[PDB]
Each structure stands twice: as structure tokens, then as C-alpha cells.
Amino acid sequence: EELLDLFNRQVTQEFTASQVYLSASIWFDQNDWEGMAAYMLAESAEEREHGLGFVDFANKRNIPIELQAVPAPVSCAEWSSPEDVWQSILELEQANTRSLLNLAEAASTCHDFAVMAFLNPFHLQQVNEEDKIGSILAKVTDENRTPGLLRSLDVV
Amino acid sequence: EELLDLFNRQVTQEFTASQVYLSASIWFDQNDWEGMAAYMLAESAEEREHGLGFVDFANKRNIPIELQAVPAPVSCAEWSSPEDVWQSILELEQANTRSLLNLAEAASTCHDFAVMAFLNPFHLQQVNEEDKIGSILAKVTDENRTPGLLRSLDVV
Amino acid sequence: SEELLDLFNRQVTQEFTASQVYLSASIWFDQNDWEGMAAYMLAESAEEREHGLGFVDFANKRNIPIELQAVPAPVSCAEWSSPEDVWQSILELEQANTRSLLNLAEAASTCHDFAVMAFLNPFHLQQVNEEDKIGSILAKVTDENRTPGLLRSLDVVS
Amino acid sequence: SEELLDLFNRQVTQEFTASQVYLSASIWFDQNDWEGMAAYMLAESAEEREHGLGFVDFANKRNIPIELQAVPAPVSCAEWSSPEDVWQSILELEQANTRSLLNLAEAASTCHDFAVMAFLNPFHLQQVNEEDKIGSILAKVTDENRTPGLLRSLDV
Amino acid sequence: SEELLDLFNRQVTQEFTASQVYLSASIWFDQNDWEGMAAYMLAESAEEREHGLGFVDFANKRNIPIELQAVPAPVSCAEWSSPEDVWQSILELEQANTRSLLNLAEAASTCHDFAVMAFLNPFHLQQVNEEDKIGSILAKVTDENRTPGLLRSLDVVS
Amino acid sequence: SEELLDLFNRQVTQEFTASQVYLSASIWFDQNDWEGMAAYMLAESAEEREHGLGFVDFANKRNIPIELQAVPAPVSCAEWSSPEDVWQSILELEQANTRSLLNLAEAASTCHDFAVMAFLNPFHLQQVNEEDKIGSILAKVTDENRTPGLLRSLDVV
Ligand SMILES: [Fe+3]
Ligand SMILES: [Fe+3]
Ligand SMILES: [Fe+3]
Ligand SMILES: [Fe+3]
Ligand SMILES: [Fe+3]
Ligand SMILES: [Fe+3]
Numbered sequence: 001e002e003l004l005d006l007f008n009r010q011v012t013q014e015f016t017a018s019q020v021y022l023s024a025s026i027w028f029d030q031n032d033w034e035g036m037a038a039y040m041l042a043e044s045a046e047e048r049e050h051g052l053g054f055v056d057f058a059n060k061r062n063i064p065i066e067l068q069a070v071p072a073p074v075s076c077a078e079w080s081s082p083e084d085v086w087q088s089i090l091e092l093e094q095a096n097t098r099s100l101l102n103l104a105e106a107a108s109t110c111h112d113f114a115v116m117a118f119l120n121p122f123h124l125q126q127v128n129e130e131d132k133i134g135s136i137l138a139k140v141t142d143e144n145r146t147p148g149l150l151r152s153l154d155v156v
Numbered sequence: 157e158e159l160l161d162l163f164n165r166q167v168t169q170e171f172t173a174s175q176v177y178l179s180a181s182i183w184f185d186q187n188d189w190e191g192m193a194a195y196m197l198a199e200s201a202e203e204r205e206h207g208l209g210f211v212d213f214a215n216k217r218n219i220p221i222e223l224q225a226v227p228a229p230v231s232c233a234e235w236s237s238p239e240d241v242w243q244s245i246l247e248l249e250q251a252n253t254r255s256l257l258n259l260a261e262a263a264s265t266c267h268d269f270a271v272m273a274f275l276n277p278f279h280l281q282q283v284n285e286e287d288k289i290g291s292i293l294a295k296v297t298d299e300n301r302t303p304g305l306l307r308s309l310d311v312v
Numbered sequence: 313s314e315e316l317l318d319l320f321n322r323q324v325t326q327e328f329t330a331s332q333v334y335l336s337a338s339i340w341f342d343q344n345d346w347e348g349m350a351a352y353m354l355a356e357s358a359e360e361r362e363h364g365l366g367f368v369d370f371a372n373k374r375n376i377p378i379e380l381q382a383v384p385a386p387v388s389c390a391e392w393s394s395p396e397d398v399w400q401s402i403l404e405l406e407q408a409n410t411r412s413l414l415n416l417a418e419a420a421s422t423c424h425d426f427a428v429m430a431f432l433n434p435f436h437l438q439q440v441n442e443e444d445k446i447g448s449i450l451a452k453v454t455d456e457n458r459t460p461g462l463l464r465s466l467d468v469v470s
Numbered sequence: 471s472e473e474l475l476d477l478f479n480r481q482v483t484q485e486f487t488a489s490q491v492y493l494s495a496s497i498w499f500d501q502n503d504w505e506g507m508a509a510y511m512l513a514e515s516a517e518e519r520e521h522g523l524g525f526v527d528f529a530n531k532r533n534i535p536i537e538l539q540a541v542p543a544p545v546s547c548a549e550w551s552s553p554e555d556v557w558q559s560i561l562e563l564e565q566a567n568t569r570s571l572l573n574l575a576e577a578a579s580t581c582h583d584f585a586v587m588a589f590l591n592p593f594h595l596q597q598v599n600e601e602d603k604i605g606s607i608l609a610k611v612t613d614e615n616r617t618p619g620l621l622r623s624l625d626v
Numbered sequence: 627s628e629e630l631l632d633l634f635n636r637q638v639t640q641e642f643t644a645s646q647v648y649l650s651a652s653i654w655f656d657q658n659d660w661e662g663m664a665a666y667m668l669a670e671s672a673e674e675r676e677h678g679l680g681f682v683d684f685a686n687k688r689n690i691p692i693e694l695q696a697v698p699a700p701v702s703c704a705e706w707s708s709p710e711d712v713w714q715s716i717l718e719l720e721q722a723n724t725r726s727l728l729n730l731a732e733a734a735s736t737c738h739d740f741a742v743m744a745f746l747n748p749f750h751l752q753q754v755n756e757e758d759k760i761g762s763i764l765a766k767v768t769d770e771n772r773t774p775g776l777l778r779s780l781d782v783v784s
Numbered sequence: 785s786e787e788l789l790d791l792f793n794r795q796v797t798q799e800f801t802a803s804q805v806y807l808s809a810s811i812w813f814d815q816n817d818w819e820g821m822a823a824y825m826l827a828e829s830a831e832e833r834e835h836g837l838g839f840v841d842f843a844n845k846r847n848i849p850i851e852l853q854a855v856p857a858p859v860s861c862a863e864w865s866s867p868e869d870v871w872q873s874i875l876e877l878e879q880a881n882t883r884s885l886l887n888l889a890e891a892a893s894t895c896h897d898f899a900v901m902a903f904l905n906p907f908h909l910q911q912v913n914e915e916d917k918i919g920s921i922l923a924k925v926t927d928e929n930r931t932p933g934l935l936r937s938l939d940v941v
Binding site: 213215216217267269270272273274276 | 571572575576579587590591592594595597598599601602
């Protein structure tokens with residue numbers, strides 16, 4: 001069952017993204033970027049809510065779920081500026097999107113209309129999310145060209 | 157036209173489900189399961205609302221509807237206990253799901269994007285409906301293992 | 313007696329039949345862009361179903377076993393060509409709902425079933441009002457339809 | 471593909487085109503003292519422009535490059551002689567808008583562009599409603615205009 | 627007289643043309659992540675359209691025939707490389723807007739068309755305010771863009 | 785505070801591990817139509833995650849470097865076959881949560897780390913409440929399950 005495997009992989013991906021957001025929050029806080037840290041923290045909670053949403057749907061639809069390990073976040077070992085963090089987060093969101101499109105493709109092949117329906121708001125949410133991050137990343141890489149200026153904008 | 161047939165049959169299945177629910181409420185009332193009876197009666201009204209929503213849509217989309225007979229319910233002749241009723245209601249909801257998927261499959265083939273959009277909330281509702289019925293039947297089957305205990309579910 | 317039981321079941325069937333026929337009238341009206349008349353018939357469809365459900369509840373309480381019968385496909389829509397045809401069939405439908413109720417009352421009266429007769433009284437009075445109201449809409453329709461477009465101009469209104 | 475970006479641009483144009491066509495109908499109605507019908511077309515003109523703006527916003531978010539095309543002048547108003555002529559042109563405009571959205575949907579479908587398909591669903595459902603409503607208005611106009619002066623009653 | 631009637635008809639095209647150019651500026655700003663400037667341009671796009679609708683409504687009342695013309699494709703977007711280029715084009719747009727209203731008022735004046743001159747007064751005062759507002763934004767923009775990153779930091783603000 | 789830093793990290797791991805085990809319990813309950821027990825475990829999963837975040841936040845303020853470890857795949861769920869088995873595994877999870885807090889407090893006490901010890905105090909007390917509550921639900925579960933169907937009637941509660 002490709003569809004079942006992909007659905008389980010989607011849950012893991014949501015919780016993986018939740019932990020990576022959490023890792024970003026930690027790096028920001030340790031480096032005194034409290035406004036960015038709070039943003040990443042809120043995003044960590046929202047990603048977990050997505051995973052929980054997929055778990056609930058799967059239970060109702062009899063798609064057997066088994067929780068996999070949530071891997072330790074790795075990018076954080078090499079972040080050295082807010083630009084590096086935001087870039088990893090963009091890449092994370094790009095991967096979340098492909099991971100949802102993969103799942104949709106599998107559902108489409110199986111003619112699974114209920115799964116396709118369930119995924120629609122997540123596809124639209126990902127469009128908004130990639131846009132929002134790509135646009136914070138533009139602003140960060142523009143303001144970091146003047147020493148200190150980026151800080152002055154972490155002022156939430 | 158296959159799409160136009162499958163759309164009419166859908167209206168028929170919603171109204172037929174409405175009557176089957178009403179037959180189940182009657183069987184429970186006659187047998188003093190007033191709680192289960194009120195539940196079935198609410199579901200009857202709700203299936204009827206789905207049929208009317210299909211009819212309204214078909215009217216707007218110029219999908220000619222012609223109302224078919226609602227057949228005499230017949231499972232009621234055979235029900236001996238709440239478990240038999242709830243088992244039939246599960247198979248009814250499984251037939252409602254099947255009927256929706258048949259119609260979606262045909263809308264897909266025809267690239268009828270509007271019909272497919274219209275069906276999405278019904279797909280997601282059926283997921284919840286089957287889960288809910290499956291779960292009630294689980295409880296009934298467990299509680300009916302001790303004499304008189306199921307009579308406690310009915311007071312809820 | 314089984315005669316009473318029979319007529320009580322028939323009454324439930326007639327209410328649900330009327331509910332379906334009212335629904336077919338809504339559909340014809342809607343398809344032909346008479347949204348006001350369509351809304352009226354849709355409300356009546358829901359009300360007739362409510363009456364059937366009231367009879368079922370009463371029967372269950374009184375130990376009158378109900379067995380639900382088929383509700384036939386409404387077939388008059390095949391031949392309706394104007395609002396007047398539709399309202400004419402609805403007036404005939406209400407004349408039939410009045411008949412099945414007076415059949416039932418006749419049998420209850422024979423049987424000295426005071427409880428059934430008491431239960432039927434508000435339904436007799438409601439049919440009086442229903443027949444009056446449908447007869448009166450039909451007279452308005454039939455008058456207004458003598459001038460092209462005039463009927464439409466009032467669906468919109470009313 | 472390329473055809474998908476293209477058709478997405480084309481959609482924005484079709485929305486703004488239809489906005490102008492509605493404004494031209496308002497003008498003919500006003501000029502000929504049908505103020506109620508004029509109010510109605512004017513509100514629809516605003517709404518079509520809002521639809522184009524919604525497509526522009528989504529395209530921006532999804533990095534579909536939009537480039538605004540000229541908005542063609544409306545052509546039908548030179549030949550309108552009566553309200554029925556106007557409402558018939560507006561029915562055709564809406565049928566044109568529906569075909570336009572289905573074209574776009576067909577392209578997204580081939581591309582497996584699930585985000586674009588989710589985004590279009592409320593528009594497919596809205597167009598069903600719009601065509602029904604204009605159809606219904608046209609029916610009434612065509613019936614009432616059979617008696618001299620009677621249509622002026624509708625205008626309210 | 628025909629001079630005036632044509633210039634009035636054509637003011638409607640100029641309002642909608644300005645609407646579409648504002649919209650094009652909004653798009654450029656959104657695609658380049660200046661959401662704050664994009665929202666300002668989008669609001670002005672709606673307001674320019676409302677002005678053209680105001681002209682159309684007045685012409686209908688005064689029996690000035692309106693024939694709606696093509697709204698030209700905006701063309702400065704292809705050339706814009708920075709917010710300063712966009713605000714500069716928007717300034718030229720408003721100065722054109724102002725000149726087209728002054729030409730209209732001049733024709734009305736020649737025609738002794740007191741109604742048209744009255745109708746135009748609040749637009750002349752509005753153009754004064756808009757040109758000032760855009761001149762001012764363009765001055766801020768050109769000053770802040772002297773330090774890398776600084777202009778960003780104010781889109782975010784205002 | 786080498787020992788102390790590593791124990792403080794492990795505590796974060798244990799909170800998030802417990803969060804996932806609660807979630808796995810919620811899933812087993814939902815799949816087996818025990819909605820009320822499932823709700824309870826979901827509620828607990830959220831609250832374990834919150835504890836994890838409180839430890840992380842304190843660590844960040846106190847400059848204890850946190851590196852987030854893998855959260856392992858829950859395993860007990862492969863063996864559960866009745867509610868009693870789930871609640872017994874949850875009681876053992878809470879006993880292990882109490883144990884890791886107590887390793888932490890011992891290391892802090894050794895280091896005379898007064899702020900860390902102050903920070904743990906409400907968690908100590910919470911763990912008392914939590915072990916008591918889970919012990920008490922397990923006792924009720926084990927009792928009601930002696931009559932067929934009886935437990936079900938009280939998830940319905
Ligand atoms: Fe997500
Ligand atoms: Fe249904
Ligand atoms: Fe009745
Ligand atoms: Fe539109
Ligand atoms: Fe203007
Ligand atoms: Fe804990």
C-alpha cells in the first residue's frame with residue numbers, strides 16, 4: 001500500500017517539521033533574537049497540529065498509523081546567522097510541500113476522493129507558507145547588508 | 157448520460173437512507189429504546205437534508221432530476237435486537253459511501269470539476285459518519301455482553 | 313381491529329407521498345425559474361413529512377404497529393407545462409390528503425376509538441385551512457395568467 | 471506547464487473583461503432608466519474585479535508570473551435594444567467565464583497541480599450559482615416583456 | 627458639444643488606466659516581497675476605479691454618452707528594478723492624471739458648462755493631495771534606499 | 785554541570801518521548817473506539833510537550849545548551865490488547881518521568897544548583913499528582929473490566 005505508507009510518512013514529516021521549527025526557536029533564543037524565536041515556536045505548535053490532524057483523519061478512515069521516530073534536527077549545528085536559519089526553514093517548507101503533493105498523487109492514482117478532499121486545505125496552506133517564508137527570507141537577506149539593522153527588526 | 161444517472165441515483169440513495177433510518181427509529185421506539193430511536197430519527201432528517209442539497213445543486217446545474225420511488229424498508233422485518241439494527245445502519249452508511257464514490261468516479265472521468273467540488277464535503281462527512289456508526293456498533297456489541305447493561309447506553 | 317390498523321398505515325403513506333409530490337412541484341418550479349413558488353412547495357414538502365412523523369409517533373405510543381410502505385415516484389411532473397397545471401395537481405393532492413384523513417376518522421368512529429379521534433382533530437382543522445389556501449392560490453394563478461408575464465411578476469413579489 | 475502559466479494569465483484577463491462587460495450593461499441600463507438592473511450590473515462589475523484580484527494574489531503567492539494584459543473594450547452594448555438583449559449577453563459572458571475556468575482546471579489537472587485545483591473549486595461552485603441566477607433573471611425578463619410596461623415593475 | 631463630450635469619455639479611460647497601473651505596481655511590489663508598498667498600491671488601484679465610476683455615474687445623469695474604451699496594458703513594470711523606479715512611475719501617473727482633469731476643466735470652462743466645472747472641483751483638490759503624498763513617499767524612498775536594507779525596514783513599518 | 789547539562793538535556797528528551805507515547809495511547813484507544821480514553825491521552829500528550837517546552841525555555845535563559853535528540857518510535861503499542869494494558873504502560877511511563885526528574889534534582893543538589901532545584905519543585909509536586917491520578921484510573925479500569933461491557937459504559941462517561 002503506497003497510499004498507506006505515504007500517509008504514515010506524512011505524519012512523520014509534520015512532526016519532523018515541528019521539531020525543526022523548535023530547533024530554530026532555540027537557536028534564535030540562544031542568540032537573543034526573541035521575536036524570531038517566538039515566530040518559530042508558534043510554527044512548531046502549528047506543525048504538530050497538522051500532524052495531529054492527519055492522525056485523526058487516518059484513525060477515522062481506518063488507515064493504520066504507527067508513529068515513527070522524530071529524527072534529531074540537524075541543520076542547527078551549522079547555523080551561524082538568522083539568514084542560515086530562515087533558509088533551512090524555507091527548504092523544510094519546500095519538502096513539506098513535495099511530501100503533500102506526493103501523497104496527493106498516490107490518492108489520485110487510487111481514486112481516493114476522500115483523501116484528496118482532506119488534503120485540499122493543506123495544499124493551499126503550503127502555498128501561503130512558502131510565500132510567507134520566502135518573503136521573510138528576502139527581508140532578512142536585504143536588512144542583514146547593514147550591520148545591526150536586522151536586529152532592529154526582530155522588534156516583533 | 158452516465159453522470160446524469162449516477163446523480164439521480166444519489167438523490168434516491170439519500171432519500172432511501174432517510175426511510176431506512178426512520179424504520180430503525182420505529183423498531184427502537186416499539187422496543188422502548190427511546191434514546192436510540194431519537195438518534196435514528198435525527199439521522200433520517202439529516203439524510204433527507206442531503207438529498208435536498210443534491211436536488212438543489214442539480215437544479216442549478218441543469219442536471220434533470222426525476223424523483224424515484226422510495227422502496228418499502230425491509231431490514232426491519234428481521235431485526236431482533238439493537239445490534240441487528242446498528243449492523244444494518246453500518247451497511248447503509250457503507251452503501252451511501254459507495255454511491256458517492258461511484259458518482260465522483262464518473263464526474264472525474266467527465267472532468268466535471270464542479271460536481272467534484274460539490275461532492276468533497278460529502279466525502280469527508282461519510283468518513284466521519286462511518287467512523288461514528290462503527291464506533292457505536294462497537295459499544296453496543298460490547299455492552300450487550302451483560303444482560304441489561306445496554307439499557308444504560310440508551311439513557312445517553 | 314385490522315381495519316383501523318390498515319387505515320392508519322395508509323395515512324402515513326399518504327403523508328409521505330404528499331411530501332414527495334410537493335418536492336416534485338418544487339423541482340418543476342425551480343427548473344422553470346419560479347423560485348417563489350418553488351420555495352412554497354419545498355416548505356410544504358417538509359410540513360407533510362412532519363405530519364407523517366407525528367402519525368408514526370402516535371401509532372408507536374398507541375401500539376398500532378406501523379410498517380412503512382413504498383412511497384411511489386410522483387409522476388405528474390411528466391406532464392406539467394405551466395404553474396396552473398402544478399397548482400391544480402397540488403389541489404387534487406390536498407383533496408386526497410383530506411380523504412385519507414376522513415377515512416381514518418370514519419373507521420376510528422366505528423371502532424369508538426376516542427383517543428384516535430382526539431388525535432385527528434387538529435389535522436381535520438389544518439386540512440380545512442390547507443384546502444382553502446391552495447384553492448385560493450390556484451384562483452389567483454388562473455386569473456393572473458390571463459395576461460402574459462403578469463404571473464411571473466407576482467412569483468417575484470410573493 | 472507553459473500552457474498552465476498562460477491560462478492563469480488569461481483567467482485574470484477574463485475576470486477584468488467580464489468586470490468591464492458588467493459595467494457596460496450598467497451604463498446601458500442607467501441610460502435607459504432601468505436603475506434597479508443598473509445597480510445589479512454595477513455590483514457584479516465589482517465582484518468580477520474582486521475575482522481577478524483573488525487570482526492575482528494567488529498567482530503572486532505561487533510564483534506564477536502575472537503580466538497584466540489590456541482589458542478589451544466591451545462590444546455588445548452598441549447593439550443592445552432592450553433589457554432582454556443585455557441579460558442574454560450577460561448569460562453568454564458567464565458561460566464564457568465558466569469555460570475559461572474549466573480550461574484552466576483541465577490544464578492544472580494534466581499537470582497534477584493539486585494546489586491550483588483546490589484554489590479553483592469555490593470558483594467552479596460559484597459559477598454554477600451565477601449561471602443559474604442569470605438564467606433565472608433572463609427567463610423572467612423574457613416572460614414579463616410580453617406585456618408592454620410590465621418589465622418596469624421588475625426594475626426594483 | 628463634441629470636444630467636451632469626448633474629453634469626458636476619455637477621463638473615464640484615464641481613471642481606469644491609472645487603476646490598472648496601480649495594480650501593476652502592487653504586483654511588482656508583491657512579487658519582490660514589499661507587501662507594505664503592495665497594499666498601498668492595491669488600495670489606490672480601487673480608489674482610481676471608484677473615481678472612474680464617479681465620472682461614469684455623472685455622465686449617465688447629464689446625458690453625456692459613455693463609450694467604454696480598451697484599458698491599456700501597463701508597460702512600466704517591465705522596466706522597474708527597484709521601489710524607487712515604481713514610485714517614480716506612479717508620480718508621473720498622477721501628474722498625467724492632474725493634467726487630464728485640468729484639460730477637461732479648461733474645455734468645460736470654454737463651454738460655460740458650470741455643472742461640469744462644479745463636479746470636477748473635488749477632483750482637482752484630490753489631485754493636489756495625491757501628488758503631494760506620492761512626491762513625499764518618493765522622497766522618503768530615495769533617501770532610505772541610500773543605505774542597504776534600510777528601505778525594507780520601513781515597508782514593514784508603514 | 786557537565787553531568788547537570790547532560791541530565792537537563794535528557795529530561796527534555798523524556799518529556800517529548802512521553803508526549804509521543806501518550807499520543808500512541810490516544811491512537812490505540814481511538815482505533816478501538818474508546819473515544820473518551822483517547823481524548824484523555826491526547827490532552828496528556830499536549831501537556832507533556834508543554835513541560836518539554838518549559839524545560840527548553842529555562843535552559844535557554846540559564847545558558848544550558850539544548851540539543852534536541854531523536855524522539856524514539858513508541859513500542860508498547862505493538863503489545864496492547866485491552867485498555868488495562870495501555871493504562872499500565874502509561875503508569876510506568878509516569879514512574880519513569882518521576883525518575884528522570886529525580887536524577888536531575890540529585891545532580892542539581894550535588895552541584896548546589898539552587899536555581900535548578902527551585903525550577904524543578906513544581907514538577908516534583910506535579911509528578912505526585914500525576915502518578916496518583918494514573919494509578920487511580922488504572923485501579924478503576926481493572927475493576928470495571930471484570931464485567932463484560934462495563935468499562936465501555938464508563939468511557940462513555
Ligand atoms: Fe505542515
Ligand atoms: Fe447521506
Ligand atoms: Fe398532511
Ligand atoms: Fe468571475
Ligand atoms: Fe483619479
Ligand atoms: Fe512530564
